[PDB]
Every structure is written in C-alpha cells, then in structure tokens.
Tab-separated table of C-alpha atoms (C1' of nucleotides) in Angstrom:
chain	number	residue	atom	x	y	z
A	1	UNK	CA	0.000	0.000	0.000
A	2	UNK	CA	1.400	4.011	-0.543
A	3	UNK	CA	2.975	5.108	2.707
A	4	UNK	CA	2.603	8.724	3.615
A	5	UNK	CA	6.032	9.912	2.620
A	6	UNK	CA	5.117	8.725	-1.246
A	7	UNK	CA	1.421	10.032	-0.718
A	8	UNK	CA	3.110	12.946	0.531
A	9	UNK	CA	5.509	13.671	-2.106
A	10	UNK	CA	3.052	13.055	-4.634
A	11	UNK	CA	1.563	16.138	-3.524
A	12	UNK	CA	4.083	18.216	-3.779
A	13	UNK	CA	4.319	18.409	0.064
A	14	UNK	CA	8.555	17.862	-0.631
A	15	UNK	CA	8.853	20.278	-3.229
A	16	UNK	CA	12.747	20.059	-2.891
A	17	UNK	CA	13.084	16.341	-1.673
A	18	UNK	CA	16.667	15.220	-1.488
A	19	UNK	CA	17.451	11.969	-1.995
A	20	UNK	CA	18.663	10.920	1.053
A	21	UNK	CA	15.113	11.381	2.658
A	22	UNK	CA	14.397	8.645	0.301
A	23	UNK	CA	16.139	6.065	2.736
A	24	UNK	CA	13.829	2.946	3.701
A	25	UNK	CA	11.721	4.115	0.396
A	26	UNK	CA	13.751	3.423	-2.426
A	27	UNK	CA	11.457	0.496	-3.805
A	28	UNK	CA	8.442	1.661	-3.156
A	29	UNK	CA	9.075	4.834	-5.025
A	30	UNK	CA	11.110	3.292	-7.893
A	31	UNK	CA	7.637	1.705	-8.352
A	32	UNK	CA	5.312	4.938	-9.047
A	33	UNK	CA	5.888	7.053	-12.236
A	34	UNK	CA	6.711	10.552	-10.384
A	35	UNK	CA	9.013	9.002	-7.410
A	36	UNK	CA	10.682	7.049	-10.128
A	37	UNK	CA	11.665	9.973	-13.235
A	38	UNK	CA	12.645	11.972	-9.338
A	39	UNK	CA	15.561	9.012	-8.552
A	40	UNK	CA	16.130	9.086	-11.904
A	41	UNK	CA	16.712	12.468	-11.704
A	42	UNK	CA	18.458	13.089	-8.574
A	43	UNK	CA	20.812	10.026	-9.678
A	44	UNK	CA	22.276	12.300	-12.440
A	45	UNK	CA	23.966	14.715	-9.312
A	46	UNK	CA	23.909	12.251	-6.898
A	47	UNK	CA	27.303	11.779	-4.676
A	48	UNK	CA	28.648	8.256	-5.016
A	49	UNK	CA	27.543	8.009	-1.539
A	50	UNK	CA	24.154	8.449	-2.446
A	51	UNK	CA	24.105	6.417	-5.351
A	52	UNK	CA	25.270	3.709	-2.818
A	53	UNK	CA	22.697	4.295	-0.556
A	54	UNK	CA	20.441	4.375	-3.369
A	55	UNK	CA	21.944	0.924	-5.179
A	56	UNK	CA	21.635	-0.826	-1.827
A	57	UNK	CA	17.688	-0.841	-2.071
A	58	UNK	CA	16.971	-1.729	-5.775
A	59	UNK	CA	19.621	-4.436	-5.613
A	60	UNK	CA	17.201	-5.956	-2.867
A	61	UNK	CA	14.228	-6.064	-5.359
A	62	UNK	CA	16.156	-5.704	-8.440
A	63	UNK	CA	14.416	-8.425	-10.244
A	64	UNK	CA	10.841	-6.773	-9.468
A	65	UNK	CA	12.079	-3.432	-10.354
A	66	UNK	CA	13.522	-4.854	-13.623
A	67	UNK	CA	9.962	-5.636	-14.618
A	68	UNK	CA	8.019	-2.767	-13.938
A	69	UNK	CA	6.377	0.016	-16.041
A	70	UNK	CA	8.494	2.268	-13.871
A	71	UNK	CA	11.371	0.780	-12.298
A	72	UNK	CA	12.921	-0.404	-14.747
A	73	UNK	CA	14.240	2.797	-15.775
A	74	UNK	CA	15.441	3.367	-12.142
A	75	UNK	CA	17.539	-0.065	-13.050
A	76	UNK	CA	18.705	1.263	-16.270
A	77	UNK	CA	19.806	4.601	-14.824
A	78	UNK	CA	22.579	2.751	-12.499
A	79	UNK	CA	23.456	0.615	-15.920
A	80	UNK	CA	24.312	4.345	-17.052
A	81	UNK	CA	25.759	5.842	-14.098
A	82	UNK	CA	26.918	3.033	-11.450
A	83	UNK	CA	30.505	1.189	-10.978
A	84	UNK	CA	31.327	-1.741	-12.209
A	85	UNK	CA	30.734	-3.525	-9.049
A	86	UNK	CA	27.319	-2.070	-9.368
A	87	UNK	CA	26.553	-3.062	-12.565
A	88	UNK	CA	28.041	-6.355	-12.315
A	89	UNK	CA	25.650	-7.031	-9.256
A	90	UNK	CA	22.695	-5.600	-10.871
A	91	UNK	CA	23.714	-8.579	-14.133
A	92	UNK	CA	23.388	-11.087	-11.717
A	93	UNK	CA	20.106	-10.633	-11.034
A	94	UNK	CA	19.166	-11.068	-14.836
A	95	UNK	CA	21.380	-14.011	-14.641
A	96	UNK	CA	18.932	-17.035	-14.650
A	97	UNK	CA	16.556	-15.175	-15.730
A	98	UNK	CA	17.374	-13.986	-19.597
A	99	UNK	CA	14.320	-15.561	-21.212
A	100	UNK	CA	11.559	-14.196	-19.850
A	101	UNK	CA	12.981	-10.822	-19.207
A	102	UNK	CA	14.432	-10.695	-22.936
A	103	UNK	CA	10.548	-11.571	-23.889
A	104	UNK	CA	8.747	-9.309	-21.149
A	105	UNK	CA	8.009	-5.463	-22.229
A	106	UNK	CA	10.113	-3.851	-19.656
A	107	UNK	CA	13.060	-6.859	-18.851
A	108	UNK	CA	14.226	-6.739	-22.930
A	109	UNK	CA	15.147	-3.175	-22.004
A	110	UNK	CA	16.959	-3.608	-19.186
A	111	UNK	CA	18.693	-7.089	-20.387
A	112	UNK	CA	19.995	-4.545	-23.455
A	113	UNK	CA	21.207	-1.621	-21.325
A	114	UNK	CA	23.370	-4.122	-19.651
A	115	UNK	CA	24.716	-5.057	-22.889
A	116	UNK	CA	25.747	-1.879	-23.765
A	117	UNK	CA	26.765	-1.315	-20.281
A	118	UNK	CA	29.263	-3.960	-19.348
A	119	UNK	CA	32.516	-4.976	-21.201
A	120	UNK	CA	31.172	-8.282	-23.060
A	121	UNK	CA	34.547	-9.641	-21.511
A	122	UNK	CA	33.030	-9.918	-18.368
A	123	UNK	CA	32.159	-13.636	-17.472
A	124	UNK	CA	28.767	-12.385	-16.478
A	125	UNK	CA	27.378	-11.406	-19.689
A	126	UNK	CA	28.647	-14.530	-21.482
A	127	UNK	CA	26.872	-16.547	-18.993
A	128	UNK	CA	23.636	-14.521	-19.777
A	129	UNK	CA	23.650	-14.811	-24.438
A	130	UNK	CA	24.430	-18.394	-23.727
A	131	UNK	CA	20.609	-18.657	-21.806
A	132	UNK	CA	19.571	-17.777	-25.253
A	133	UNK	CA	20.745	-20.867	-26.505
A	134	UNK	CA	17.905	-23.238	-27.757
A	135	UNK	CA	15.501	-19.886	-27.723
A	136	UNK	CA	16.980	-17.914	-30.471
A	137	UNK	CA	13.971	-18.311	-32.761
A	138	UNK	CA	11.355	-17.204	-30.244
A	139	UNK	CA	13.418	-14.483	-29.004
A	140	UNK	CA	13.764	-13.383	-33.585
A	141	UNK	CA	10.136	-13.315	-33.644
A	142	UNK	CA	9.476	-11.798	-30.738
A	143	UNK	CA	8.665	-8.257	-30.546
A	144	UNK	CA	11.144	-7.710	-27.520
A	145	UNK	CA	12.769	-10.133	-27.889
A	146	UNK	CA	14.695	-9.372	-31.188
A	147	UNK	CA	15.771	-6.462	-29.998
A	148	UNK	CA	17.669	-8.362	-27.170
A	149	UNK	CA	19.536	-10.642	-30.053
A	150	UNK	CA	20.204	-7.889	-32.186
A	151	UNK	CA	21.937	-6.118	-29.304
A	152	UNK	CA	23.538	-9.424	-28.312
A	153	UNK	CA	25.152	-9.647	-31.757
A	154	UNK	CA	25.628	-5.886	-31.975
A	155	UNK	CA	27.627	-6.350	-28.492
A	156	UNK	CA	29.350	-9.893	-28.123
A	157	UNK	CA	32.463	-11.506	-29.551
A	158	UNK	CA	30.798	-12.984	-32.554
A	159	UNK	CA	32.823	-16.556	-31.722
A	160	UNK	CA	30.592	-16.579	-29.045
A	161	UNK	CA	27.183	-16.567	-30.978
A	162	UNK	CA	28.024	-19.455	-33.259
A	163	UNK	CA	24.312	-20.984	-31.931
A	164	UNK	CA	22.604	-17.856	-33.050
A	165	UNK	CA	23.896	-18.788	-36.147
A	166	UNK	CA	23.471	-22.307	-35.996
A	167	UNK	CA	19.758	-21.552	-35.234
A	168	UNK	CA	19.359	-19.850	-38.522
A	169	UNK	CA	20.041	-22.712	-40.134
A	170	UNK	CA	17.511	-23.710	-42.703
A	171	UNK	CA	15.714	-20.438	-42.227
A	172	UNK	CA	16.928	-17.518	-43.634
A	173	UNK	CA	14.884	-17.256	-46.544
A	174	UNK	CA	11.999	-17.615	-43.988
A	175	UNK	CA	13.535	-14.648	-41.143
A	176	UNK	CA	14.496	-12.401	-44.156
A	177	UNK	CA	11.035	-11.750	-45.059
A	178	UNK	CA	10.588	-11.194	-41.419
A	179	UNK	CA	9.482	-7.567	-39.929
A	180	UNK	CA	12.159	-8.151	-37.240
A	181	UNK	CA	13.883	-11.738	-38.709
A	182	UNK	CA	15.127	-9.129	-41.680
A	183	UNK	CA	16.944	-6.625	-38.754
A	184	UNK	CA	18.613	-9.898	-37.001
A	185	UNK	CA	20.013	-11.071	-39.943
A	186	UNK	CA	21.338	-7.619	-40.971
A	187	UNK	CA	23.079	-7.665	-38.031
A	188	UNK	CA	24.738	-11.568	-38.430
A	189	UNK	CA	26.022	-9.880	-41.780
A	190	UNK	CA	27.224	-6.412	-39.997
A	191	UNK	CA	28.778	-8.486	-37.323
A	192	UNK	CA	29.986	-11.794	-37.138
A	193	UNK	CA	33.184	-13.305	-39.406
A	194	UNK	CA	33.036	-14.346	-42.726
A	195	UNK	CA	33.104	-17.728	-41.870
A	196	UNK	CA	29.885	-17.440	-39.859
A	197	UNK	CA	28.011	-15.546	-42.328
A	198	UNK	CA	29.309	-17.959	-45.776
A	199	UNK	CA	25.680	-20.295	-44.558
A	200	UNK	CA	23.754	-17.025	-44.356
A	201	UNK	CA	25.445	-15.641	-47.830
A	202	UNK	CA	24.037	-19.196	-49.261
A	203	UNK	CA	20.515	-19.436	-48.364
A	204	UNK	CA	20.187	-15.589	-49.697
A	205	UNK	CA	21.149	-16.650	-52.757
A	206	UNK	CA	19.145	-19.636	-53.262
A	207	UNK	CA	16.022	-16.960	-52.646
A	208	UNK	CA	17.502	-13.622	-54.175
A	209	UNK	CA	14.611	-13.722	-56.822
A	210	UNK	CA	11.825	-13.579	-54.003
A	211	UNK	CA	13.636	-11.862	-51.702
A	212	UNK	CA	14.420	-8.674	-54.228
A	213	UNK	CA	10.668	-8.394	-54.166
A	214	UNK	CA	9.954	-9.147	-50.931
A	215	UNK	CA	8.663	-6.212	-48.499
A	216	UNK	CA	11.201	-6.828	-45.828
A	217	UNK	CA	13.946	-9.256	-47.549
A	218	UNK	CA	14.573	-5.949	-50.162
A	219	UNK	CA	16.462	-4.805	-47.310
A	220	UNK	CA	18.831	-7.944	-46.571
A	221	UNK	CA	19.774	-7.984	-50.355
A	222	UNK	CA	20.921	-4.555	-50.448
A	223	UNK	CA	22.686	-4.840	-47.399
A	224	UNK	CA	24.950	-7.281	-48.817
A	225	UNK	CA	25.145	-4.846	-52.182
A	226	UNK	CA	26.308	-2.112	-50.209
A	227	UNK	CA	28.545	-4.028	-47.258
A	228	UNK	CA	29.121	-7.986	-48.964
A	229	UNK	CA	31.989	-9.174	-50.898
A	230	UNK	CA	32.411	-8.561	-54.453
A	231	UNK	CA	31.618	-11.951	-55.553
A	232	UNK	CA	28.217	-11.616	-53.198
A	233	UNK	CA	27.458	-8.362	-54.920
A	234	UNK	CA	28.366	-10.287	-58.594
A	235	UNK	CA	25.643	-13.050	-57.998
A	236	UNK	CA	23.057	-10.403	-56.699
A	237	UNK	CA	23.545	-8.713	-60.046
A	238	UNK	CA	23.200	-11.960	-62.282
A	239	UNK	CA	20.040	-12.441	-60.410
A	240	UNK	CA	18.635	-8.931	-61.304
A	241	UNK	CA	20.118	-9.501	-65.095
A	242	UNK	CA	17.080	-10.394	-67.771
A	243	UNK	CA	15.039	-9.155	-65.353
A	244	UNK	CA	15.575	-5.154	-64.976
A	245	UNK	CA	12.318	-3.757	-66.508
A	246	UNK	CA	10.165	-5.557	-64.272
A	247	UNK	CA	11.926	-5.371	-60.983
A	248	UNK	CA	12.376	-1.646	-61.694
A	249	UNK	CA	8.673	-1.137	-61.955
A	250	UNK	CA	8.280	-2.630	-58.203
A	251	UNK	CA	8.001	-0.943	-55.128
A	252	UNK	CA	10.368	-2.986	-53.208
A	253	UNK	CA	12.657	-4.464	-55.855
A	254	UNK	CA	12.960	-1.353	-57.736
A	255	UNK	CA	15.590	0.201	-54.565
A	256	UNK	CA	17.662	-3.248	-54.932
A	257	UNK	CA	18.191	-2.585	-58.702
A	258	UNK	CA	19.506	0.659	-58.218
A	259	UNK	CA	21.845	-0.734	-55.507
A	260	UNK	CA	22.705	-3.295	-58.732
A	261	UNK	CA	23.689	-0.275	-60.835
A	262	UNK	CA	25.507	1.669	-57.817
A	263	UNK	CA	27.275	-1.475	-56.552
A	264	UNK	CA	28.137	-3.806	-59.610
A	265	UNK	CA	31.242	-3.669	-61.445
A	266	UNK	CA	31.970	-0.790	-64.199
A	267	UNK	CA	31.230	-4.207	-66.923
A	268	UNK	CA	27.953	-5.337	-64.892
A	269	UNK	CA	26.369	-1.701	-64.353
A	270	UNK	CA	27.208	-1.658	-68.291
A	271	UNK	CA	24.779	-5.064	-69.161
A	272	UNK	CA	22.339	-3.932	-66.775
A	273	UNK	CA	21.678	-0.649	-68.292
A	274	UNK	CA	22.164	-2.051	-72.060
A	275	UNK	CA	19.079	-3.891	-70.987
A	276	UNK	CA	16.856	-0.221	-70.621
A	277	UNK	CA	19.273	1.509	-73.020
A	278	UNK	CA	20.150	-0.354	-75.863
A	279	UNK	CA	17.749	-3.840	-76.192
A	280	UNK	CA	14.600	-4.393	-78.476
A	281	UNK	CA	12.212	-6.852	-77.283
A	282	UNK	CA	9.195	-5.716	-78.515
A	283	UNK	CA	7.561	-2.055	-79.502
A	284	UNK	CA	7.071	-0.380	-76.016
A	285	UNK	CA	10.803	1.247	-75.577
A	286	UNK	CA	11.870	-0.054	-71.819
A	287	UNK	CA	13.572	3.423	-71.382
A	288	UNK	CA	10.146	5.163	-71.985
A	289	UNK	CA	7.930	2.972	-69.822
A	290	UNK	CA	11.169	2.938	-66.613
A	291	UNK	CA	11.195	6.985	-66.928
A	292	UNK	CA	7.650	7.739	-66.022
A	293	UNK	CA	7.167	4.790	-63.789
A	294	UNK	CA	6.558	5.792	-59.944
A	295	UNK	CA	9.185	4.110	-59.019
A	296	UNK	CA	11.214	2.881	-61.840
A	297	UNK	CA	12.208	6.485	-62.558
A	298	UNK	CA	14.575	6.308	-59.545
A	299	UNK	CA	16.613	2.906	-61.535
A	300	UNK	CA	16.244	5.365	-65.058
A	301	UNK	CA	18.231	8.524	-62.523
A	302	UNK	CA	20.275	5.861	-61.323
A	303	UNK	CA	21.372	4.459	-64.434
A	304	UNK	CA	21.955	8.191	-65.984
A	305	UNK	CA	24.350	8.904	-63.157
A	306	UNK	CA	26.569	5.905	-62.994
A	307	UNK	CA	26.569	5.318	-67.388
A	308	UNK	CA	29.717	5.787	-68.760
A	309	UNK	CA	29.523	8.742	-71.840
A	310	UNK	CA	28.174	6.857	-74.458
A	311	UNK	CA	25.145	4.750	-72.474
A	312	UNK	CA	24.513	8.116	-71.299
A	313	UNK	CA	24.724	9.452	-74.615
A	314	UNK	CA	21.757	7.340	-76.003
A	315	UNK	CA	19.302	7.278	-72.892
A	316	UNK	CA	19.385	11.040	-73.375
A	317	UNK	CA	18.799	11.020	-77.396
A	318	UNK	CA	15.718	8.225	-76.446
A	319	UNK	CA	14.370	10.373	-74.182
A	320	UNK	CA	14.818	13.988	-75.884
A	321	UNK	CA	11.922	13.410	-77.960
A	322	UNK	CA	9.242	12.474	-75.068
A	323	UNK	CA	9.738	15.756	-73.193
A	324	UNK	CA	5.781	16.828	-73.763
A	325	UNK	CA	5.244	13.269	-72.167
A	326	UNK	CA	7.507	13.367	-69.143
A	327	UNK	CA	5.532	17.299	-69.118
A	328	UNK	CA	2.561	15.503	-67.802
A	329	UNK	CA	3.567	12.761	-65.513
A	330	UNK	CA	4.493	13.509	-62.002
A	331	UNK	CA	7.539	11.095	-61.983
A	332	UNK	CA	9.648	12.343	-64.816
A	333	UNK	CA	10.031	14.949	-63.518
A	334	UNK	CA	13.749	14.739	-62.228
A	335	UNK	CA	14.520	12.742	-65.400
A	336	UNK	CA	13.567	16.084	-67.474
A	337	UNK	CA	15.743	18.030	-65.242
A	338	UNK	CA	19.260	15.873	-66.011
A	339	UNK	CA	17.665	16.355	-69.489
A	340	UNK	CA	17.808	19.881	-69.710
A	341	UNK	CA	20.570	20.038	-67.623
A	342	UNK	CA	22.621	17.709	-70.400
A	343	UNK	CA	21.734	19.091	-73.213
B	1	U	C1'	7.943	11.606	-56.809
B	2	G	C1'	9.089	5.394	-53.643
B	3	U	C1'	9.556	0.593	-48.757
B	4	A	C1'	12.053	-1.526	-42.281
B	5	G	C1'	10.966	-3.261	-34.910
B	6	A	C1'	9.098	-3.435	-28.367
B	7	U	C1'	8.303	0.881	-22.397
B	8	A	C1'	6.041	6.409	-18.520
RNA sequence: UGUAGAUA
C-alpha cells in the first residue's frame, strides 16, 4: 500500500526532496511514475555516496524493479551511471533469468542496457547470451525479444554466438522476409566473421529472386550490395540480369536494382543498363515505360548517373523526344531536369 | 515523386 512519505511527495508536500530522505523508500518509489523519473533524476547529481545508498535498495528487489512500467528505468539509470561492481551485481540478477525478461516489455530493455553497459569480456554477460541458446527463434520473432539478439550480436564476440547462427540454419529465406527476422540477420552480416556468415550468404542466394521483391527481404539484399563481398554483390547482379524492366517497376525491388547499378562492377552496371538503353524486345521502348514509372524512374536517374559517356549518350537522345510526355507525368520529372541540364 | 521493430 502508498505510505505517507510517497502520498506525501506526490503532492508536492517535498517540493525540494533530497534523496537521502528517500532512505527505507527506495522500492516503493522506484515503483510509481513521479518518485521514479525523481531518482532518476536526482541520480544524475547524486554523490557516489548516495548512489550507494540508493543501489543498496533496488539491488534488494532488483528483479521486481527490472519488470516494472516504472522501475525499470530506475535499473537502467545505475546501468548508465553506477561502478562496475554495481553493474556487475545488478547482471546477476538477470542471470537465470534472460528468457523471460528478454521476452517481457520492460526486462528486454533492461537485459539490453546491460549489454551496452558492461565490457562483453566480463564472465557475467557470457553466462547470460548463452541462456539464449535453444531460444533464439522465439526471441527473432518476438517483438522484444529481437531487440535483445540484435543487441547481443551488436555487443558480443561474434565466436561466441556461433548458436545464433546455428539456429538460422535452414531459415533464412523464412527470417528475411521477417518484420524483425530481416533486422537480425542484418546484423549476423554487420557483425559476425566471414566464416559465420558464408551459410547465411548461401541461403540468400538460393532466394535472391523472391527476396528482391519481398517487403522486408529488399532490405537484406541490399545490405549485402552495399557491405558484402564482391563476388556476393556479382551473384546479386546476375540475379537482377534479364530481369531489370520488371523489378524496376516494383516498389520494393525497384531500390535493390539501383543498388545493382551503384554497386556492380563498371562491366555489370554496363549489361544492366544495355538492358533499358540499348535492347529491343518488342515495340514499347523499356527506357520510356522505366522513366515515367513511380518508381522505376529512380533505376532510369540511377542508371543516368553511374553510365559511362556513351550509355549516357543514347538514354538522353531516347528520351529527348518524349519531353511533352515526361511534361505531364508527375515522376519524370527529375529525369527532365538531367535532361535539360545535359543538353 | 518510392519501402524496415518493443516501455512512462
């Protein structure tokens, strides 16, 4: 039940509480919105005496505090501002605990504030990714708990997350189309060795075709396009070869062709804009149908600013005498501009 | 002119 002193305080009765006053209270107030942002607050000038003082009460109910609406930023606030010692005790208290905090609203934020806050050397936090072992697919698909396994890998000696890894096996065409799946992976590929990731590299290639178009997966191919090895990049592009004038024309594999024509080689960007530059298929001219395309008018800009003279040379002759037609579309209107701006 | 996750 709310003692007087928190009664009290929350109305305004203590208009300059200190801190100290707080002795015997520390829990109780950690618990309430206002009493909590106050600690939080005083924390920032407290003394290291006071933080002590302070420390020695939410260590007592640390694992309460760690789940509730309001505590757990009292927690966080020592991850910020206490010792090592401090810290290190507070970890202990997640320790044996790392599932159900890394799923629970308020636990996945404190679990990640200790990542960031203590050196990933410290025996401590190994013991605590390993609990994730055997979990690391709930914890993906989670919506709290990805973010704990994105700051795991973000944090941790990648040797160490090998099962992370391991648990992706099989699935990566799956967690790439994935609202959060998609931001895990992303990280593997930011993170971990080349030798962890060759397994990931594989699977996305199996499934580049779907994934290009894929709401979510559009992402984890141009990751690799911007960040992946050049022989990574070079199998992206064979993918997207034969097929620029449709993927162009869609809203989530149009943004991976451009990264095609930004990211290939000087002899790939070449065949991939021969294919919108230079090609006859049937009457419809791909150039005209890409440049007043919502979307594909982006690849067309693209492709303009990355063709060598005399690519450039004929895009801008093919589109010199549609100028009245890129007049009355909305989306040529940047191509008309380079036009102008060319000529 | 065009797409990415859980607290007071």
């Amino acid at each position: 039940g709310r003692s007087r002193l928190l009664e009290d305080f929350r109305n305004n009765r203590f208009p300059n509480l200190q801190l100290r006053d707080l002795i015997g209270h520390i829990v109780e107030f950690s618990q309430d919105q206002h009493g909590s942002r106050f600690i939080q607050q005083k924390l920032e000038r407290a003394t290291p005496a006071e933080r002590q003082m302070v420390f020695n009460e939410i260590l007592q109910a640390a694992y309460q505090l760690m789940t509730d609406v309001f505590g757990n930023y009292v927690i966080q606030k020592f991850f910020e501002f206490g010792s090592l010692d401090q810290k290190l005790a507070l970890a202990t208290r997640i320790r044996g605990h790392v599932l159900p905090l890394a799923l629970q609203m308020y636990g996945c934020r404190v679990i990640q504030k200790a990542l960031e806050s203590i050196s990933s050397d410290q025996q401590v936090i190994s013991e605590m990714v390993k609990e994730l072992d055997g979990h690391v697919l709930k914890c993906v698909k989670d919506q709290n708990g990805n973010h704990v396994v994105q700051k795991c890998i973000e944090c941790v000696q990648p040797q160490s997350l090998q099962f992370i890894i391991d648990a992706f096996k099989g699935q990566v065409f799956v967690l790439s189309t994935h609202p959060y799946g998609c931001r895990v992976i992303q990280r593997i590929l930011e993170h971990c060795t080349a030798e962890q990731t060759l397994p990931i590299l594989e699977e996305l290639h199996q499934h580049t075709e779907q994934l290009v178009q894929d709401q979510y997966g559009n992402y984890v191919i141009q990751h690799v396009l911007e960040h992946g090895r050049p022989e990574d990049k070079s199998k992206i592009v064979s993918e997207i070869r034969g097929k620029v004038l449709a993927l162009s024309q869609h809203k989530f594999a149009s943004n991976v062709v451009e990264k095609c024509v930004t990211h290939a080689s000087r002899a790939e960007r070449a065949l991939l804009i021969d294919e919108v530059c230079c090609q006859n298929d049937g009457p419809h001219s791909a150039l005209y149908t890409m440049m007043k395309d919502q979307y594909a008018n982006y690849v067309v800009q693209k492709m303009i600013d990355m063709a060598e003279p005399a690519q450039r040379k004929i895009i801008m002759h093919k589109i010199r005498p549609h100028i009245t037609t890129l007049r009355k579309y909305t989306y040529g209107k940047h191509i008309l501009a380079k036009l102008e701006k060319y000529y």
